[PDB]
């Protein structure tokens with residue numbers, strides 16, 4: 626069948642594992658799983674279309690220098706995730722973009738912006754801010770929460786749609 | 792606040808009222824409401840952003856000749872809806888596109904493609920077909936059902952996102 630190599634990218638502790646765990650095994654990872662390279666692949670029906678979502682949850686901290694180069698060349702879609710209480714995670718959602726452009730030899734590659742953790746009162750990255758970066762980037766902006774599942778499907782499915790025009 | 796004039800467009804009996812009724816008043820309209828010009832407007836939080844969704848559900852049958860011209864000039868986003876069991880509704884999702892381009896003096900205007908009624912066994916418009924029209928159009932493709940609510944939010948929210956880059 627059709628199938629999709631989505632890489633889930635972003636900083637440490639922003640949520641990208643709780644995102645994926647939400648998508649597949651249907652629960653919140655309050656508890657612990659301090660991980661690096663993780664691969665799940667699912668038989669999924671997106672808009673009447675049968676497809677394999679093959680998703681590479683990645684490691685935050687840069688124990689990961691040129692190893693980012695590998696999978697990034699083998700990623701069709703990229704979910705660039707950050708958190709709304711960690712302004713710094715936002716600031717770094719640019720050098721991820723820049724390294725992807727590097728390895729891809731391309732300046733527009735399927736990508737979605739995800740300001741995660743939105744069920745929190747501890748807001749620091751306003752939407753308005755985040756949104757105009759998506760704008761600067763030409764990539765969508767979808768806010769999310771792995772606590773509430775809120776946003777999680779919109780998030781992954783949008784990216785797929787991005788790949789479809791590419 | 793920010794606010795969004797979404798027009799919901801498409802053929803007769805494809806579902807565009809059951810779509811909207813699903814979005815707002817939270818139920819399926821099995822029963823009856825054979826309608827023309829209908830306006831609902833909602834205070835909605837889309838991705839941390841407060842906005843007024845002002846949505847014009849429209850009439851199917853062309854009792855509607857130049858009256859389409861009016862609201863179409865006052866529509867930011869357009870949901871172009873059809874049904875998966877009515878190949879003809881598909882075929883006509885082009886002359887809606889063409890009249891919008893007409894009145895807009897524009898060839899790319901925020902728009903989403905919605906092949907509705909997907910909870911049905913009576914399929915006639917395959918995804919593959921529909922999808923490559925979205926492609927031909929550069930507009931997304933989202934399948935939906937007002938029976939199951941399935942797709943309904945993805946549908947409207949995507950379009951908003953389309954308007955945001957425009």
Ligand SMILES: C[C@H](OP(=O)(O)OP(=O)(O)OP(=O)(O)OC[C@H]1O[C@@H](n2cnc3c(=O)[nH]c(N)nc32)[C@H](O)[C@@H]1O)c1ccccc1[N+](=O)[O-]
Pocket residue numbers: 636637638639640641642643644654655656657658659660683684685686741742743744745769770771772
């Ligand atoms: C960097 C390292 O792990 P990492 O893999 O580099 O970074 P992750 O994004 O994978 O971290 P993970 O998503 O597993 O943890 C997210 C943290 O926020 C919480 N969580 C996740 N997303 C949300 C959200 O949407 N809302 C709410 N309310 N809670 C959420 C989790 O309980 C967890 O403490 C890591 C760092 C810090 C904490 C965890 C952690 N980890 O490996 O689990």
Ligand SMILES: C[C@H](OP(=O)(O)OP(=O)(O)OP(=O)(O)OC[C@H]1O[C@@H](n2cnc3c(=O)[nH]c(N)nc32)[C@H](O)[C@@H]1O)c1ccccc1[N+](=O)[O-]
Pocket residue numbers: 802803804805806807808809810820821822823824825826849850851852907908909910911935936937938
């Ligand atoms: C043209 C005229 O009305 P119209 O306003 O021109 O066209 P509408 O799209 O508004 O028609 P509406 O959406 O109200 O009705 C949809 C029909 O399919 C059913 N329905 C809607 N969408 C779905 C879907 O996702 N799945 C399923 N299983 N059922 C759905 C409804 O019960 C209804 O019979 C009209 C024509 C035929 C029938 C109704 C009708 N109408 O005014 O209600």
Ligand SMILES: [Mg+2]
Pocket residue numbers: 641642659660661682683684685
């Ligand atoms: Mg992880």
Ligand SMILES: [Mg+2]
Pocket residue numbers: 807808825826827848849850851
């Ligand atoms: Mg109607």
